[PDB]
Homo-oligomer: A and B are copies of this chain.
Amino acid sequence: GFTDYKVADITLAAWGRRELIIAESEMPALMGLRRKYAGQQPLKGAKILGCIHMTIQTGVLIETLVALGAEVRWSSCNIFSTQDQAAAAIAAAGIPVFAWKGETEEEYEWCIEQTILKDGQPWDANMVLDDGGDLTEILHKKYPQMLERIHGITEETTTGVHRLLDMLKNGTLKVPAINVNDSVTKSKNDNKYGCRHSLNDAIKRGTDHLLSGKQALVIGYGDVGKGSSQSLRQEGMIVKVAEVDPICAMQACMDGFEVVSPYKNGINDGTEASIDAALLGKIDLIVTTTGNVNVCDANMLKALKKRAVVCNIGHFDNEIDTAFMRKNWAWEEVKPQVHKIHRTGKDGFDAHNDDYLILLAEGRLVNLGNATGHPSRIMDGSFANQVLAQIHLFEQKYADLPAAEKAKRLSVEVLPKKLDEEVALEMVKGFGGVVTQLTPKQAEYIGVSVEGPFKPDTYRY
């Protein structure tokens, strides 16, 4: 008589389970952690609040935490990223989950709250797993007392890490965190190669547009912008790249991309005259990858080529000024998460109007909103890091320290390189790759152990 959940349709659980069984075969690092730690039950007595996209891959993460001894209560960190069959399979296994594809904002907040409250009262949670910092913010702001019991937070993504570092700087962070994002087997795997796989996937599913031969503008060239640019270039798009960071812009040039600004002289003074109208007038697709605010702004949207596609693969939808488009332009739904935005006015639209843009996932994370985000074999790296970060903080028991010792222990850290290498080795073996073992003389020659770590902590890969 398990009822402690809310999903779109529980009858999808058998389908969800079939896809979980396939995903386990694609996630050797994660499944290897189940075998390595199951006898030891290192998460026995852990009670984890989880807030991350309720996909099949998150399903395998959740069941790994449970196989290692944890109880969890789960929600998604985006209104469109849940795969309903994954949420169903998790609920049907007796696990509290509150997530469905197509939540309203109010439902999104309610879902987080159902993880935080059990039977109307704060759950006795002692760990947090977060992706974007929304659950972390709600606990700090609305349930600060619960953080007196919590041993740490493991944060998945760049945007969430920034918010943790803000709190650390301000002295408002109450528990230590692991920056899971900055493991190499996360940031340089998930953020880059994951978006390479899933950006053109989402655009094809949403529009079925030919990309070859067409003009794209990618805003940003960090890890997600690098992966996004490659996703489009390998399809034969002519890709241009915008950046505020000259080092990242240098890499885009060397990678064979023309680097341009939406603005004359690169100066964003807020006027229409600042827009390079010739440039925007040729662009068939714009993709925002920055984690910043309003990098595809109202004047850019006004200048864009008719029938251009607009989408965002950064964590939050405020990269694009969708508010301006809601206020001024008429939205025509093509199908779920695909809207034609008619620039002729707000008062209805001509069904045969040519002057529209196509917006994907209402500006929300497009790879998860219009497709299924990253594939299992990539999320294997990210989620093996999450499990190890959860064990790492849970075994250190920060919440049991006195305040003076807590202050010394409070930090936002990355996992040590030896663990990053262990995850990577399991990923490499999953491809059938064979890593070479150094001889003792060679290890001495370059100053490393035969067992690693193989690089100084300064190394950038």
Q: Which residues of A contact B (CB under 8 A)?
A: 15, 18-19, 21-22, 25-26, 56, 162, 165-166, 182, 184-185, 187-189, 193, 196-197, 201, 204-205, 207-215, 222, 233-238, 242-263, 265-268, 270, 282, 290-295, 307, 332, 334-335, 340, 351-352, 354, 358, 371-372, 375-378, 381, 414, 420-422, 424-425, 427-428, 431-439, 441-442, 445-447, 452, 454-456, 458, 460-461
Contacts and interface: CB of A to CB of B under 8 A. Distances in A.
Contacts of A438: 244, 268, 292
Given A210-B375, A249-B424, A442-B295, A262 B351 contact: no
**How many subunits of this chain does the assembly comprise?**
4
Contacts of A334: 15, 18-19, 22
Given A201-B201, A236-B256, A246-B421, 7 more contacts: A185-B250, A197-B210, A212-B253, A213-B433, A245-B454, A253-B431, A265-B434
A22 B353 CA distance: 10
A424 to B, nearest CB: 4
A445 B237 contact: no
Given A244-B437, A259-B428, A437-B267, A461 B251 contact: yes
Contacts of A248: 454, 461
Contacts of A439: 268, 270, 294
A189 B248 CA distance: 11
A234 B237 CA distance: 12
A370 B249 CA distance: 31
A136 B307 CA distance: 39
A246 B425 contact: yes
Nearest to A437: B266
B249 A435 contact: yes
Contacts of A193: 212, 254
A258 B238 contact: yes
Contacts of A270: 439
Contacts of A261: 434-436
Interchain residue pairs A-B with the least CB separation, the first 10? A259-B433, A236-B256, A213-B253, A246-B425, A210-B377, A210-B375, A246-B424, A460-B460, A234-B234, A245-B454
